Symmetry: D2
Subunit: 228 residues, 4 copies
């Protein structure tokens, strides 16, 4: 009982629990690391992909440690620590600007009722920038070589996707056109934007699930499979 393989395959996996997520504060570009539970989340994701027989040619991550660490753990489980890995800031979560580090109570104080509803249901609401005196995650040395004009300071989800999309088109798509299997360890908002883009959707997945996109040699999407 064997199944015919696709020409190319894209697997998108979400990173596990970060310390900010556990403390219920917004992180965005704040470089919060995995908790012990988040490390176990990464081991579980690696075992999920191994049980489906995935062998990847390349793995992508954001510049954020919770994504990079998840990638390393997953590749460790898959016995693929040797494969090419690529990290880039354009796969980063939204930069939340002023909202960086806020909890639920501070969000409700900062946003009007109407703004909060748009913030939850839509993708177009842009947070304001980091305040004077607020530690801004993008002042990190890891960003020292980027064009300063391009560094975001308060991003809606739409704006995040406008700067992630060129990276997806210029780095991930060409590898899929070569017939490769590509893994991406990703933030939730980025994963959902990529899913919407590929399926051509218009404007909620169980924790620990992965998305499997299968393509033919003309980059037609043949199937989207959820594995868990």
């Amino acid at each position: 009982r064997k199944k015919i393989e696709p020409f190319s395959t894209l697997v998108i996996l979400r990173h596990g629990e970060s310390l900010s997520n556990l403390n219920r504060t917004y992180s965005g570009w704040y470089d919060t690391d995995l908790t012990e539970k988040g490390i176990e989340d990464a081991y579980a994701a690696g075992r999920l992909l191994k049980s489906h027989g995935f062998h990847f040619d390349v793995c992508f991550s954001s510049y954020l440690k919770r994504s990079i660490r998840t990638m390393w753990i997953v590749l460790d489980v898959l016995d693929q620590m040797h494969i090419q890995t690529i990290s880039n800031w354009r796969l980063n979560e939204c930069h939340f600007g002023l909202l960086t580090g806020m909890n639920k109570e501070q969000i409700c104080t900062t946003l009007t009722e109407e703004e909060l509803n748009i913030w939850k249901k839509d993708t177009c609401l842009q947070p304001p920038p980091c305040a004077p005196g607020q530690e801004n995650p993008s002042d990190d040395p890891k960003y020292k070589d980027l064009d300063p004009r391009v560094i975001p300071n308060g991003e809606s989800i739409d704006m995040m996707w406008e700067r992630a999309k060129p990276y997806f088109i210029d780095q991930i798509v060409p590898r899929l056109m070569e017939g490769k299997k590509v893994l991406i360890v990703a933030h939730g908002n980025v994963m959902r934007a990529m899913k919407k883009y590929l399926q051509k959707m218009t404007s909620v997945l169980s924790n620990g699930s992965a998305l499997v996109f299968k393509f033919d040699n003309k980059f037609n999407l043949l199937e989207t499979e959820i594995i868990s």
Copy 2:
């Protein structure tokens, strides 16, 4: 001397330009004068002593051939060259292949004025039965969704900018000297971007320090 240097150079006369039709992505090649324009551009850069670590071009032949000629004059045929569609001229859609009179018949008085003076007017897409330059096999591996069909200058820059930021800026931050052989609209958009805002045969020279501050913009000519 500066920490890094970017030289931008425009390609020379194309056959469409000589016949006074609009090309956009239409893959028109250099005329005899366009070839001599490239040799003269090479001699201008050689007289200023430029030695480049890398050269960029668009996916369009008039840009690629100019790069090859320039590098030949500079005795740098061996350096790395990179061509990419994101540096292409605007895709003119319906206006592709039209001459000046056809542009007026197709565009109203207001549309033609904004098309001439501004950057925001988007031409309509190619008509049915019109040869679309993006159907070229050289674009067969691009994400089908990203291929344009009718672009304003603003739209062209929105897809060229990520390439400039991701391929050009990192090399300048490494201290390299970078050459770009570009189309007029792309060169003007890059200049406007870098300066936070030219006579034929001229070249733009951008000098940067190690924080990527623009120290000077020099126009060199013969």
Copy 3:
């Protein structure tokens, strides 16, 4: 106060204790992992580089887990988990062929007294290939895309360096010539061969946990070799 910096810098680290090392068997390409102590060796090496202020533009490892895992830990300590990393089989330890997995007693049985002395003091003695029925580490799926003719089966140290040298020249030197700071997490024999090549030492002429620092000018002249330790 401050010292004038070199144009480019190459730091070479050795990986820490592997399980084969703890059990006193030769590994070579056998993909033995770090022990708990080897993991702590990697954290300590990271702290060493952190106290000397190193910020690398790129890090290289072999295809062997014990080297890759050491690289990951060191970059974690350095807060450089985002930097580019490159792994390649040409930085692998010698493929020990038949000697793979042997302990001291089996080595002494297999080699003559003359052969053993040359084995310890020289770099030219080549082991035989893996025997029939012996598990060969190169049959690992991670090597499936290599040219089958290039895969070694029993290497002397000289032979190891003959296939590592082109990688050093084609991938590390060009980045040093760009002015970059390069980290290599290496195997002991590979580190020693690189040191010999760079210093122009003869075949005639570091404590555990030490690192080698090579400093170069823009013509790739070796300006200094510094040994650093805690």
Copy 4:
């Protein structure tokens, strides 16, 4: 059709070849006939329908220019090109710039016979006061220790082989179609390597190697 394809082409007439002197790394350029050789070679590949994913050349101008002309004929000027010194012709050292008569004066009777019949004779290095082609600024970023000065054909292949294994084989394993514009000695060494020959084609022919997904050589076709 095969999983992957390698085409190797030799560059056309250089000025040194026309003058019957040995160039090696001497950076002699194509003649007007040599440029026509490149156009002819391009038309040969076009008539067989080749569409390449990438093209390789040496750092020598006669190889680079041939690559550019061939890609012009193929309507593939946009494809990725890679040039590298490891695909260079032998560095002839002292023999650089010499003609047939001078090589007789320099080499003994035995040495000249080894030079013509075998691949193992290493020429001596460039003489004092002899302009060395490796002093070219295009080589300024190489490890100075690696630069040759007098290379037998065997030595040339020892430094070209790792480039073939590390750059060309992985792309053939990816299922790509690869073009190499090469020098005769380099082309012959690659052919011997791929066919496993032990240690005679028209000037304008091309070699076509067809492979399956395990990198088994299914067939070698000569087109002219």
